[PDB]
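#struct-pred

JT: dropping the chains for the assembly here, can someone run the whole complex?
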Amino acid sequence: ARLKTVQSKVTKSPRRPFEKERLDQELKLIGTFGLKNKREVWRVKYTLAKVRKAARELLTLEDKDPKRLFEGNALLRRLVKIGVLDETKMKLDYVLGLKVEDFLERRLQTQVFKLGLAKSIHHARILIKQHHIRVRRQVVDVPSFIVRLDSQKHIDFSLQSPYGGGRPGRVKRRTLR
Amino acid sequence: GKPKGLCTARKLKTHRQEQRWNDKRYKKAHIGTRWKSNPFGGASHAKGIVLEKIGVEAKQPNSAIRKCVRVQLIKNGKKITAFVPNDGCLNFVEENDEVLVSGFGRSGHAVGDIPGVRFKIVKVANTSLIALFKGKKERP
Amino acid sequence: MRGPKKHLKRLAAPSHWMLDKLGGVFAVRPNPGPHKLRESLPLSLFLRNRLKYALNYTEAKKILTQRVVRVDGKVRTCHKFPTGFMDVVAIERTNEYFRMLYDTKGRYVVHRIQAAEADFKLCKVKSVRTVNKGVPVLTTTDGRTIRYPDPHVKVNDTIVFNISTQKITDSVKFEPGNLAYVTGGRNVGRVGIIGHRERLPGASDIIHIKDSAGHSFATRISNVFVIGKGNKALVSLPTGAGIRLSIAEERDKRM
Amino acid sequence: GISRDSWHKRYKTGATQPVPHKKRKFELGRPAANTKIGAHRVRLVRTRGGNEKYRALRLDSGNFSWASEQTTRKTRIVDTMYNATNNELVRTKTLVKGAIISVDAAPFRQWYEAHYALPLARKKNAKLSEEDNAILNKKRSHHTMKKYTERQKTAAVDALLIEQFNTGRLLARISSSPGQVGQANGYILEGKELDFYLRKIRAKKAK
RNA sequence: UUUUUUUUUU
RNA sequence: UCUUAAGGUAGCCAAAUGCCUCGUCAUUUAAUUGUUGACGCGCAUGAAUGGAUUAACGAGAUUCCUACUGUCCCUAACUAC
RNA sequence: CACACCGCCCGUCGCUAUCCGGGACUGAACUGAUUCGAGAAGAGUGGGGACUGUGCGGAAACCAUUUUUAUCGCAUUGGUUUGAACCGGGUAAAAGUCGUAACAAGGUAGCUGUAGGUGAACCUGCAGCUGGAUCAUCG
RNA sequence: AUGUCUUCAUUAAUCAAGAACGAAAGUCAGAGGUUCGAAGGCGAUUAGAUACCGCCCUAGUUCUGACCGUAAACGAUGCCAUCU
RNA sequence: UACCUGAUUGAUUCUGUCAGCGCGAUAUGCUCAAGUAAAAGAUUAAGCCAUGCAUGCGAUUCAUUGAAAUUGCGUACGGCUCAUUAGAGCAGAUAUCACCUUAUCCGGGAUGGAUAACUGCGGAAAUACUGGAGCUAAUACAUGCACCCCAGCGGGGUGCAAUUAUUAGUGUUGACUCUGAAUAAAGCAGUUUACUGUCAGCUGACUCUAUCCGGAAAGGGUGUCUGCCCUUUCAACUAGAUGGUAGUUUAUUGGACUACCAUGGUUGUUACGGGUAACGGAGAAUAAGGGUUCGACUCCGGAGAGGGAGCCUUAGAAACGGCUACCACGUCCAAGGAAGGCAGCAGGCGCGAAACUUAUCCACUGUUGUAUGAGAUAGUGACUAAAAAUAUAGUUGAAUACAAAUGAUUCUUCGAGGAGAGGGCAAGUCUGGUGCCAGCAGCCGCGGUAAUUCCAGCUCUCCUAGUGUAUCUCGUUAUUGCUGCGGUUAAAAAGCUCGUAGUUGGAUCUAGGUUUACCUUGAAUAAAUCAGAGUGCUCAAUACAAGCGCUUGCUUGAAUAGCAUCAUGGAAUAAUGAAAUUAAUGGUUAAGAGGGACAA
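RK: done, full complex below.
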């Protein structure tokens, strides 16, 4: 009959639930990049830790290992295409230097207000929620959506939004009526 | 010292198995009478009926009378004492009442200054005792 | 169970068919005959996945009832027929001819061919014996038994079998210096030149084979099929010419 | 019903074994044929795979074989004489493989004379009957007598066999299983085995 | 030579 | 506190030894002044006037279960003298 | 001992609660195996021959027997649970009675083994140990 | 232990099960019974004193032949080999 | 992320546990804007079941296209559950020269009489009950249409298969009593198309049905080697028990069974017995490394259909949506009789802490294909995995989808809750009551009339549509220690010695200028899961897709790694063997190991 659906976790809780240093640092990160909850940042931390642990497991092997070559090139490729890893920094011995801020900057929510599409990060989030942003002719309503290097330059206002060209909003229609 | 020869695997394994029985946790989990001795029969929750209510002198240096109720489990008919959390909740427990009971937290050990009491009431008359204390509901 | 089985679950189906995990609870079971369950393919799977000729299996059965498909030149209407290795499939209405072949990965690929190609096929000699009346026969690994064959034909040798004439044309030998296919093992879909033969008396013997790229690997006899003499292949091979690319080489080829 | 299962026994070490399942069809047994001497009686039994066996209940004729002469003639089983397994079988006249019985000699004598144009220790004072003459003294061309002359070249017969043929009841051993093949085809005893079993039989009847 | 005790918490 | 030579110790018990008494509790039964097991301020138990046990043994005393039966319900018939 | 000797602390006895053990009662209940007795039903074999096809054949009921053997009875035995007069152990409980056993040379140094005795802690005999209150005492 | 230019040539270390020995007290049987001395009985001391102290003592303490197999049977430290 | 923190004291350092702390499983509290995938009466009661369904579809058509019936085929697959079960079962390798097979592949192999529906007569309360009478059909029933012997003139036999006995060796396998060629009998019952629609031109070609032999393939029965839980308050066990011969039975081997015979067989390298809240595996949770625990459950193997037992049919069953009997428990009776098996789907009662609609369909996925509670759709569903609103949803009608639908994907009308706030541990000595009471508190501890801990009121912290509580697993735990603990005083060296099993054992053989064990590399090794490339399903869990031209098209990806057996190479390390006509004829040394002798 039906099978087991394949699931997987992305968030790993810290071993110490409370410590002023981590609490304050993570609060500061939430402030810098508009996020919803600490799970958001733990997700990025655990993706980063998966990346770093895989890179370390690879570096434990010597340089020209077939697996090392394939995985390291692929991982550097993925980070490059996302726009986190530097394209002049091609090595895992150097990928072992990254932070959550790097991946968090590559969220749509940041780019919206970064490139002048919104005043505040909160305004950017509510605009995306109300469907006033678009990417490569693709209305993405997911703030954590991950913006690649290529798509970095392919975001403008929605082709249907009142602010991107369309019918006036509900308030404007009320006033006109 | 322990044996170290390259052909002593049988001795090492047999000795380890023999000495595991001197461990409280392993013996407690593999004795075989756990189900017969444990009132809940290995479960986490159980249901029962009230018989009477008692006040237990809290241990020294604490001075108070903790208000518990003697209950009879429906699964096996065993008699236990269950604690009624929160203030003025014994009022909501009347003799001959159906109660849901759970562990107190220390896995069959008494908790705090209440002597010999290792269970606690989680529902009375199909109502949550916390709801009864908080006024979210009333006695059926 | 109390008797034979008729079904075959999707997961238990051989992996080489590449059947999507979320694509139903059963897999079309090949019926007994020329080939074996783990070393064949259903015509229904052919028409549904490889050629996209059928959106659904009802459509596959509809196409198959029309008696338009030929296998070995014999019109089949069994969607569960065991179309396996070195099997000729000729859809006359569309005038399309295919021969079953093992991809480097080991999968079966749509190997388009012409009429001259479709007109023949190869068979390995599974045994040679003497049926009643004193007429010697040979049995091939695909079950085909051929009467009155050339006496020099022996075990593990290849014979060209003519579909149109149902006769043995040529007899290629299993000896050092013959292009040999590799059907099973982890070297399924690998073509290489036979070399030395480690002879185990009471167990399957071992063969050494080196491909055109020079890579060498060994295997058991039962996985070794001769497909020619010297270096020439008696049939056309798919794009790849029986060479295993390592993963880095495959990526390099991709970009 | 009757089962041939390996379980239900004790293990090599003497331990009791678990019963793996309820009795299975493919491991059944059937009651013994226990064939006897009398009018031909054979039953068909349907067996595994749709095949079928011939269970003999009573048999009188044996299609017996003479090995040296390479001949095979249908004689009649006369009496049971010796059985290695158990003597109740010989007492009850059970025809079981390897059982030792008595057969007629007339068919083999008829074949011997019809094939060798010579007497088979025939009686020393009794003239051959008309049927015997119809095959002994017959007259045909010399081209036909030549083959008989050639067949005469190798025609000596052993003393023990001659004595059995004199008594008219030959000793034979059943080589078939009447409960399995339904037939009592056996072979005539001759030589070392014949002497051994004759000595056994004589020892028992002395006992 | 004889020489036993000191209510509970803080 | 009176008092003796010493004040019944270890054991055991309503006993073949306890009046009150058909002692009180339990067991056996439908029902028991009976049996057995407990209790013991024991009218008046008790240590070679031997105390407490004890396998085997007994034409010794006692209670019960089973089998069996004219002991009985409830008598009848037959044989010898 | 640290509330610092007006310290700490040990037992019997008495009350309360609770867990466990022994216990006459051939106690009781549930459950599994094994011997024996009976034994349904099928299958094999030997009889039988209603009926109908041509002295021959096929044959149903039924009878006897062999085998597989459910199931039921006693009987033995294993395992789990359990009542019981009474007789005992352990533990817990703010403020019960009797004493002073131990911690100072604890007022008879303490403790181990063994044996006896005494309301109780305990006392005494023999041989050990220092974890002693002596690392020592002059040849 | 020491001495050995004697002999064998790995025969060794530790050891479940198994076995010998094993203080004192204690048990059985037979001899002995001086001293001391559990229990016991007295005189003291004491609030009491079933103790410490004193007096008279029974088992025992001694020997022979059997049992028991335990001690703070302690160096509270298993045995064998090697280095500092 | 290879991690710790509070608590014994007047204070200190330890031992040691308790408590805290992270993940996961199950249950449950409060709360929950909409959507996507998605587990789901296993745990206890393999308990009991009302009611509906879950297995039905070429030859034979005088009923009105095809009903009914007879045949044929299938119902041994599929589905469910985990009770039993500890040389059972399973995993890997491996035999079956000891065996059995329908469906599907390759080779060879226009004969007569009776019976239903149909007509009618009927019985019973009651069945999916049936007897007579009149027909009447067949792929039903029947019937089948060159060597040997005598005589080289002539007569017979020889198909396959098969019983026994015998002959020579046209092929293999490592090896064959294997397969072929023959010889002599005899029964043997099995087989070598009286089939449907037909078409083309006396000549042809189909589709179909039936049917044996040989070989395959697929499936199964058995055999071998290695591994797989706890227990000595189980140490000895076993009597068809171990083996031999002759038989019987089976498809075949076999003490499988029988007769006779012998005394064998297992065991401290753990036999035998007992327990398991025990189906085995693939795997799951946790997780530096080494591991610890679990695994009823979607795949593979096994078993069962209330408990037993016995059978019919068949290629295949000891079948249970087949029968027969017994036991337990029910159902309808007009009391004469007749019945039942949801551990299939959906539902009901019970049991419980614990688990969903008495729904729609073959539209999708397979079964031989109209039929399929297999399978696919929708319902309840904070099991769970991913993605996300409360600031700077809904609604009306359209368009889409679907077997029909709903809900998703486009337009248009209007239009915050859980825990917490003394320490562990992030976060208040604010206000009133009570005076060790009520209460809190996992632990340490607060509350005794001036409470940061309760009861309130006011305030803040963690997480967040989730967050607590209870039981259990793993980590924490070097508190089970192989890596890797400890034993003078904290728990722990036997009173001491001898001693079998077990464990461990001194140095020494080509340095230079035959067996094993062990290591390396390959062979055989179902998927799904774990690790692992690529790809904007909007991301991600996921999934395995997809991506360009232009219409009649090209290219695709759907990878790569993950005990025992066999072989190759290596010859250190550790065991093991050789010797008590010529040649060097053949014994290592004698341990700052051990034993024995001698001395005094």
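JT: nice. Chains D and C do not touch (no CB pair under 8 Å). Residues 9 and 17 of chain D are 7 Å apart (CA to CA).
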